[PDB]
Design an enzyme around this catalytic site. Structure first.
Site, PDB file in Angstrom:
ATOM      1  CE1 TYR A 128      -3.306   2.950   0.712  1.00 55.70           C
ATOM      2  CE2 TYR A 128      -1.699   3.578   2.394  1.00 55.70           C
ATOM      3  CZ  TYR A 128      -2.795   3.888   1.601  1.00 55.70           C
ATOM      4  OH  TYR A 128      -3.375   5.141   1.680  1.00 55.70           O
ATOM      5  NE  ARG A 174       1.911  12.995  11.522  1.00 51.22           N
ATOM      6  CZ  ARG A 174       2.342  13.596  10.417  1.00 51.22           C
ATOM      7  NH1 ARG A 174       3.445  14.333  10.450  1.00 51.22           N
ATOM      8  NH2 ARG A 174       1.674  13.452   9.275  1.00 51.22           N
ATOM      9  NE  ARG A 201      -7.993   9.519   6.439  1.00 51.00           N
ATOM     10  CZ  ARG A 201      -8.784  10.435   6.992  1.00 51.00           C
ATOM     11  NH1 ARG A 201     -10.068  10.496   6.659  1.00 51.00           N
ATOM     12  NH2 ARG A 201      -8.288  11.297   7.874  1.00 51.00           N
ATOM     13  CG  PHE A 205      13.521  17.497  -2.460  1.00 49.78           C
ATOM     14  CD1 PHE A 205      12.317  18.196  -2.494  1.00 49.78           C
ATOM     15  CD2 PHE A 205      13.525  16.149  -2.810  1.00 49.78           C
ATOM     16  CE1 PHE A 205      11.131  17.562  -2.869  1.00 49.78           C
ATOM     17  CE2 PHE A 205      12.352  15.502  -3.185  1.00 49.78           C
ATOM     18  CZ  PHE A 205      11.147  16.210  -3.215  1.00 49.78           C
TER      19      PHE A 205
END
Ligand SMILES: CCCCCCCCCCCCCCC[n+]1ccn(CC(O)(P(=O)([O-])O)P(=O)(O)O)c1
Lengths: 334, 334, 334, 334, 334, 334
Positions: free
Chosen positions: F136, F183, F193, F253
């Site tokens: 997933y 978290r 969900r 980044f």
């Protein structure tokens, strides 16, 4: 920019047919610092060499030269030497010396002072022993290597270690000075000056001028080889010194003169021409010509190449033939 | 310190002209390892080349050479060769050999072993096919390139890839060897030695010796050009090999010989002088005079330049003209 | 390998017997980019030089040359120039051009666009003032230096500051062009081409061609030295541009042409031969032979040596004697 | 070390609580050059801020300040400001200024001359138009930014472009200055100083002092945001400027102030506390705290973070909301 | 991954609260080499600190520690310290030690040997003169610095010059040790151990324990400031040493400890709390928030920032104030 | 310059409080390519999450999303989501997407295609096994990492290796996703969900929702710790990935979000707050307060310190305590 600094570089090119280009190639601060150093040294050397200046008059000038750097109006107008222009227009040179960062002025003035002491100390005596020869070379050249080294570290372009190791730096100077002295025997003889150690030539003849007399040509070539042998002892230190350099411009500046010096000793080794006329540098071995003196491994190769030129030519008869092979061997297995 | 190590370096300079200086300039452990490796190879070579040693004696010497490295007292006193000194005082050399880190001994011993086997194999025959030419060159030169490479990697001064890619290392040796063989046609013919592939020269004359006869000069040059085209095929590998080196002392060591070989092939191409004596290597172009073989880009340019010197001289009438252009075309585009 | 790409390198070597080697040594993507850029420039240059192409037909070709890069079938079969092959097989060239990454294509197209406009502008007129000389050189050479710099940056091999500093990149081109124009006087006379600025030579003779008449030799040399003095003014920018470079392959590519241009200017200075044929490039001292043109400090030293070579031959009576000294003084000092 | 230099650094630390540290961290020559530049500018500011100096004694002092740098004995004993020590012992400061390389002297002297003009010019008049606000900031901050940039480039630690692009150097100054001016609204009012552009606040009140008055707050925050939006316009230039920096010590010196300034404008935006007292330097997001202002990409990210922080707190109410969103959009898409 | 190495890293994290992270960040072979080097040092230190050990039984343990590294089954179960685990399971530690490359073992072993001697030498002897304080420190900390520098060079991640500079490498250790010794007064006091130089505290009180006595706070502080002033003398070498570093991981490793040491000297300077417990690390501000300790310019900024905090808190009274300003001034200026 | 591109970065800053800053700090072409990529993913995510969209209709939208990029008129007006704005004005984003180089478009389209497949597949099921948890995350996060990595290698700012090693790139996405999922347990639960793997949570309670009930607080934390331990396994790959990057802008980044994720896990470990509210990051530490996340060594150190913060809080009786110590131990020794 300063027109006085332009005048300085003009003098540098007038007085240094060979190294003006590589000095001008030094990065940033070292450029002017070394140009000026070269010039004040050329002024001091001109004072030392001028024979129209009696000893009593000359000593105080050599002793105080380092302080004249701080007398804006000081100049010398009574010199008859070829480069007397740097003494007569010394105010222009000292002006630029005083524009250098203080940390460089300190180094250069210190060197000039000690050089003056040694030069004066050698006006009334010839070089006797080899130990004395090293003392004289220390004063006229060793100190220069030490001075330049301290400028490299002070500028941070090189490691602090470069300026601290005064022995290795002294060796850079002693190698070049001995090489010039050896090569300039004939010229200095007609000039009336003796630099070859008396303890060395006094064992082949009784007058250093005797090596000029063909009937002693053999005796000359043997003494010649003993001194060259003596010079080769500095190479280990030269290699060590060059190996610590990291700034490309400084490396070129330091390496090239040393390579030229070694090439000169090679050409002079067992060469009777040293006592007749100019000795034109033999030129190129297939491999040496394939590289230049801008990276340490190449410099080493070039140095070793010239070493072999000397080894492969050591005559058995030569009284130093054994000491020559020994030092060249010690250098090879470094 | 070691009196034996100083003796090894004495022999290095004595027996080596093209590598002595560059070998001594190598960093750290590679210095001693390559020096000794060169001495053991020089010894093996001296045996291989001594025509006074019967085949009955020579085969066992070549085959067992590698183990002599471990026999403290082994030595050979019947050599009539110029460098016989390394065979008579081999104990000193093997003494220093066993002194090397075990990993280097592994490489040097393995190469001497395989080299001895291959050489023993060619004592009774001449090179026939081009496949046999590569085979022969591999035994006397390719293996050396592979050994040196494995030594560089073992020392860690170069990446493992250098020692691992034996094909590229092999091409380094084949290129130098083929170039020397081509260049020394005449010097070898006068010595009773033949190395040009028979399968190639037979298509021009009935005997290799005929290329020394003024009437076969045109055929000699066609054969000459064909062999040179053959050698040119190793250049891509030579460029790939040199492009992977990170250490400057190693780079200098590996690049110089390759560039000198390339200049030789260029000077020999379509040149009748190859069969009249020793061919002079005309200088380079203005661009080659501007740079030395010390950085990869400079070496590429030098190599590409010499490639064009050949391309410019390819006459349409030469039977290999077309193949010569193709390989050069390929080298330019990669 | 691409057959079309193989063909481009074939053309590169056909039309560039001296720069091909350094171009082929460029790292990664710059190699093909610069190769193609050179070929399209060579094509554009051939159109400009071809006098059998009338102005009215040449103007459109020059103005639109940039768009042809994007027309797969475009070619030109009427040129009678020596390098006409790049024009007749341009489809092969523009093909590989459209294969480059877009960032290179954009810079190349932009430069050809601007260059074509500039070349067209001077087709009718001749160079008048020195300011116009600069404009013409900017169009045929300065833009090339600018294009190249942008190609170095785009590839990331050079810092973006290299591509951004168009002023010094332009100077790099003006210096090479002015040198070539100066050196090629006679050759351009015997070809109906005039490139020396009129407002300069008119002050010496009535027709530029007069310089070719032995009775005007003295006047020709004066004008020669004035133009040479003009060109020397670009050296500071050339040194500054080269000093910013970081990639070795790029540095070699950029510095060598400059050093050669400087050697050329050194040879032609106050040389009457310029007006009688070709000039033989001599060569200087050990410092020159002890170091090559592959590191900045060494390039500086080489340049400074050639500067002294000119400075030393400066005749007092020359009308530009002072200006020659001051520009060389500026370079020496700063 | 000169006692005068030690004293100069002693003063630097006395008069520069938040910066003597990053100035002392500058590499080589830039260290003393910026130390002295800061000190002289400090002395000039002390004169411009000392209200106990009759306007007729002051104007000439601000105008000729730049020339006192060459007058060994010059000094000022009638100052009562806190930093009265730099004027009182200026001889020490001017002495070290004259020991700096000539190229740094000319830069510093020129900047003080021009700065002295603008200061005297704004001694009686407050800022009217926004155009005048830029002129004012240019004279007290812009020129400092331009001066530092010329010093950075003359030292060779930074590219030649940094010194040539005056607009970008100017912006770095304008941005810091406007920011401090904005943040220091109250303090300026509780001191008789008025720096906020009249042509802007005059559209919100009658007397700039009315912003402290509680009822006019809404119009106050409206005016405050308009100025902040005005300052934000310099950001693109600030990023461009910082992007050209390559020396780490210079980068730290230039970057910290700009980031702190941007962080300030973010804390003061739409904040009422600006008219109640001094504002705290608010932290930010987890980032920033996880990224330092030591590499350009990080500084970029930090700037954007603060841009967004502001963008978010933009009330549709505020009349400048449209312009504020617009400038931030430009900055983020650029 | 071996389970004995995992165990060593477990011990590393156990015995090193704030440095395990930076040690684990070290590149390549330095990672395990320093981890192991840190554990053997923990062991050897655990022995020197243990008091339940016979001085006559401890001496031999210290003297032969360097050899225990080669005795697989060696371990010490009689220790009664908190880090006794590294002694009782030393074989796991020595085992990994013997897995390190030979070149690293030589260094770590050599340092432990010389270290062992010095530690013994001070068992039945206190610190008297400041020169002795430097000798002791040289033995417990200084040599550690020298060893690390040698490991950095041996690993080739740092220039060979890093290893050579043993003096500055030694100062690095002296600075940290004097700092802890000064900070850990009370704890060491309430432990029966005395490290503060006798010649220093004696001039204040009769028994070093007196400082713990409240009624002497003043005399205590003065002795404190005098020692702190002693340690500050090492900053120049610290800054110089860190400036030479070129590897990022090594830099972080060396810089962080140094910064914290200075942040401790600042916190403690002229602070009575030193004798009443262990003082806290309580910040800096502004320019600090904008810079970590991962680049030389930032570390300098940080260092100078703290130097300022100390300089500002210098009581006019303290009998060392002058000397404190003298060294802080030399650090600022030079 | 583009009003639409202007709008894109506008959306990027409204829909990405965690990547906007660092995205806008990317070098050259990566900037727009990434900004666009994050906007299309944003839109795709807005579809998948929207529950007001019937599964019957949602499947087609997710399968052909990759195709909507090439449909200038495509948009979705029936979204109820908060970021619906990107779907309704998708043509503005598809417009910019189409302006990108093709290689960048190929990557964004492909990932968008494979990402629509996986999301559709999970519209009907919840995560069962841990293997299905990786799957997933692979579709919603791993592919985003793979995509970005390929974009870096296509822009050439990073080597081809970054885009080739899909495994390491997948681990980057998995670490961030798993961290976020862990978290946001509560927030997700209150939104209906469920992402935690049933095979893990069913071993503690009957329904995932039970961790929301206060009586299950202790069981919830244990599961929390088991999940955190699972996520930690990706850290070795995170370090490997980060350490092989060479572009600073890309490094920042990539590193910053990872370090943020690590800090978050460290804060969430054994923390009951996870099931009552949102957890705040308690980053920093005296040693790391001397570093930021912009250089590998520092990032390693920061990561390691966070691992220790977790290791220190591991409860002996925690069912996963062994596994947690194991993975941490491995991370320490690798
Ligand atoms: C080389 C390492 C690459 C690591 C890539 C990790 C990708 C994780 C999945 C991101 C897919 C793109 C999602 C864009 C829209 N989006 C989804 C969730 N969020 C949350 C946020 O808006 P944001 O974290 O800014 O992206 P937040 O500020 O509330 O945290 C935004």
């Amino acid at each position: 920019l300063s027109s006085s600094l332009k005048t300085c570089y003009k003098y540098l090119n007038q007085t240094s047919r060979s190294f003006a280009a590589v000095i001008q190639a030094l990065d940033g601060e070292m450029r002017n610092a070394v140009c000026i150093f070269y010039l004040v040294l050329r002024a001091l050397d001109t004072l030392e060499d001028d024979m129209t200046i009696s000893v009593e008059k000359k000593v105080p000038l050599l002793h105080n030269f380092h302080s004249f750097l701080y007398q804006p109006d000081w100049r010398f107008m009574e010199s008859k030497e070829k480069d007397r222009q740097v003494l007569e227009d010394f105010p222009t040179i000292s002006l630029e010396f005083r524009n250098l960062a203080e940390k460089y002025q300190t180094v250069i003035a210190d060197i000039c002072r000690r050089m003056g002491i040694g030069m004066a100390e050698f006006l009334d005596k010839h070089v006797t022993s080899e130990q004395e020869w090293d003392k004289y070379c220390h004063y006229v050249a060793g100190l220069v290597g030490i001075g330049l080294s301290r400028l490299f570290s002070a500028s941070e372009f090189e490691d602090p270690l470069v300026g601290e190791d005064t022995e290795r730096a002294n060796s850079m100077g002693l190698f070049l000075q001995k090489t010039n002295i050896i090569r300039d025997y004939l010229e200095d003889q007609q000039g009336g000056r003796e630099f070859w150690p008396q303890e060395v030539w006094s064992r082949y003849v009784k007058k250093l001028g005797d090596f000029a007399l063909p009937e002693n040509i053999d005796l000359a070539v043997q003494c010649l080889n003993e001194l060259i042998t003596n010079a080769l002892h500095h190479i280990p230190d030269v290699i060590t010194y060059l190996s610590r350099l990291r700034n490309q411009s400084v490396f070129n500046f330091c390496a090239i003169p040393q390579v030229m010096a070694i090439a000169t000793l090679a050409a002079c080794y067992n060469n009777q021409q040293v006592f007749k006329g100019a000795v034109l540098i033999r030129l190129g071995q297939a491999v040496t010509l394939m590289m230049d003196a801008t990276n340490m491994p190449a410099v080493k190769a070039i140095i070793y190449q010239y070493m072999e030129e000397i080894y492969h030519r050591i005559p058995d008869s030569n009284p130093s033939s054994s000491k020559t092979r020994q030092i060249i061997s010690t250098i090879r297995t470094q």
